[PDB]
Design brief:
The structure is cut from a larger assembly and holds chains A (about 170 residues) and B (about 60 residues). Chain A has 7 helices and 3 strands. With about 170 residues, chain A is mainly alpha-helical. Chain B is built from 3 helices and 2 strands. The N and C termini of chain B lie far apart (about 25 Å). Classes of the chains: A mainly alpha (about 170), B mainly alpha (about 60). The interface between A and B is small, with 8 and 5 residues. The complex binds manganese (II) ion. Chain B: It is found in: Cytoplasm; Melanosome; Nucleus; Secreted.
Amino acid sequence: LDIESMTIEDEYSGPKLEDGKVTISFMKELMQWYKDQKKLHRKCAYQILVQVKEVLSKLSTLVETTLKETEKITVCGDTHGQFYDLLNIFELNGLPSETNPYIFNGDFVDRGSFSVEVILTLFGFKLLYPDHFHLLRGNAETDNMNQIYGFEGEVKAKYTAQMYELFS
Amino acid sequence: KENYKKFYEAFSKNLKLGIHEDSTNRRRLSELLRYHTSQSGDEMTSLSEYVSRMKETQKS
Ligand SMILES: [Mn+2]
């Protein structure tokens, strides 16, 4: 239970993110930490990755959803690990709240540029609005390409290799 | 912290060799060593941190 080994730092001045759903207020702050090229603390990052595993591993391998006649869904495609585009759509088409039940067709580690930060925010939003926010796997997405496009190196640069095992 | 990490990974063998052979600078070289421990997980510690975390009953 590496999360309960403490070793907290808050060099980022980061709020504690609990095992309960991440507050929107921080998520807005996290988007600002991307406007400012700033990163999460490790115990919070480990704790969200644990929770993300626990929810995602139970979701059906084909996702089934009924869209009511009066309801509208915004559908999204390849992002190549740049958050700037989703930054804007969230701000433009409404933040990905229950009123913006987005579906994202994967391809986030498709390339590395802000890609850790991309999945790190998407995985934040997925905990707060799991019913509305839906993530698929992309087609450029396996260890084979996590290596070719240096995402494995981003992880190994920012964190010790066990972090890459958890992300896997 | 990050430039040291890169350095250490590349040249930790040389520092460790220096402890072995250099009888005068062991005192300074030892503070450059970094190790994984049972209470640092996937991070590494200086020996000086090991010490600051020692219990009052530990004498070694
Ligand atoms: Mn793709």
